[PDB]
């Protein structure tokens, strides 16, 4: 249930002594190292051609956030603030009021993408699949406040990526 690494007492017959001395004087293990490096010289490398080739992702991937809509145009967020109670970073700021037809809807849905730890507790705490953490990861900005999303930016990410987000949720929701 255990083994002894490096507890080999070497042989002292003239065969093994001359083998070790030929290894010392003729550099056998150094040529073994050169052979392994030469072996990787003639291998096809593992380099994908980014941006033209992309690294493989799964439908569970947790990237850029997006507020979704029902298949009628109505937004799914019913202002229940579970995503900001569960948020380990307190990145989500929510303020709500009844809108002009009496629906429980948010007026403030902020996510600070520089507080966010991208762990997806908001999409798994959301009872109506409103906030999701979509598949976009290429959204680097040049300014800090461009990573401070309001409700307009998140609903635009939903409208921008819904054709992908709905298919990822369709592929994954029986594991959830």
């Amino acid at each position: 249930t255990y083994k002894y690494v490096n507890l080999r007492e070497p042989s002292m017959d003239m065969k093994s002594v001359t083998d070790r001395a030929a290894q010392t004087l003729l550099w056998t293990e150094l040529i073994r190292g050169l052979g392994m490096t030469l072996s990787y010289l003639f291998r096809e490398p593992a380099t994908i051609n980014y941006p033209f080739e992309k690294g493989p992702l799964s439908p569970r991937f947790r990237g850029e956030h997006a507020l979704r809509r029902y298949p009628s145009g109505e937004e799914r967020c019913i202002a229940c603030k579970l995503c900001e109670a569960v948020c380990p970073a307190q990145a989500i700021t929510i303020e709500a009021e009844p809108r002009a037809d009496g629906s429980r809807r948010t007026t403030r849905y902020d996510i600070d993408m520089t507080k966010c730890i991208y762990c997806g507790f908001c999409q798994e705490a959301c009872p109506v699949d409103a906030i999701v953490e979509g598949p976009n990861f290429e959204f680097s900005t040049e300014t800090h406040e461009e990573l401070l999303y309001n409700k307009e930016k998140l609903l635009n990410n939903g409208d921008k990526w819904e054709a992908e987000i709905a298919a990822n949720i369709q592929a994954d929701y029986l594991y959830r």
């Binding site: 150094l30 050169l34 010289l41 291998r43």
Partner: protein, 312 residues
Amino acid sequence: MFMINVLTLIIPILLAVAFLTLVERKVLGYMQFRKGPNVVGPYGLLQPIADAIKLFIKEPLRPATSSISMFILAPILALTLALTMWIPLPMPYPLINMNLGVLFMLAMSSLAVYSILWSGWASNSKYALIGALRAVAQTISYEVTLAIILLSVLLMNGSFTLSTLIITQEQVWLIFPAWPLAMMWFISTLAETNRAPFDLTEGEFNVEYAAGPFALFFMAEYANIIMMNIFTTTLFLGAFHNPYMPELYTINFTIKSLLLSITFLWIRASYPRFRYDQLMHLLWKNFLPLTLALCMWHVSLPILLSSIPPQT
């Protein structure tokens, strides 16, 4: 006309040093299961040009130098000695055909440590000075086995003439009578140019130089690398020379020197670094006793075989 010959020596040295950096990054890339540079040029060929233009317009690092004069002279001396190590090299005819080209090269390579020493003292950092003293002691250490191995091999040549060393090897490569001298020579020239696994300047002296002069030290070091591979090629792997077609020798020694420079690139992507005492142990307690023993063997061996080479 001779000035044209000096230009056709020294400008292609600079071009081959420029593209050796690309060959290093590519060969180290593919040996590391990745690619080297292939975006900046077609197959990466514009990477050294882009990098040279980048370094020459980067801000000067502006150090407080101890001596201004030696801070200027250390790149000057490094580049001048890096270029003058090529002029006795027979390929198949040298620029300066001299009777003592071997001893000239050993002398001008012995002078190369002053650039390291002056760059180390001309910086105000004591850490850079300690690193320079370590690098100078390393280089002057391995120059001992350079001199003695080189003498022992030239006991089969008859002279210090580098052009005679091609005539010496018309029946056999000189690595076949002298492969232990060849392998200790090869590791010793690997330790001359502060090259891995002997690069303790990268393991935790010219760090106070700006991007321009540091690039000049870097290109002088790679000119020394290409030159010592060409000198090892002429010294142990002497090609066939047809006097009516010299380009046969030129193509042949070029292929052998490229393989030997790639062998430097292939050593540096294969081994970890020595500790400083470990390569001191490698010189003084391993290479130098065998070097002295083989020097006795190559003194006494042309006498016991009646194979003393001609003086002329």
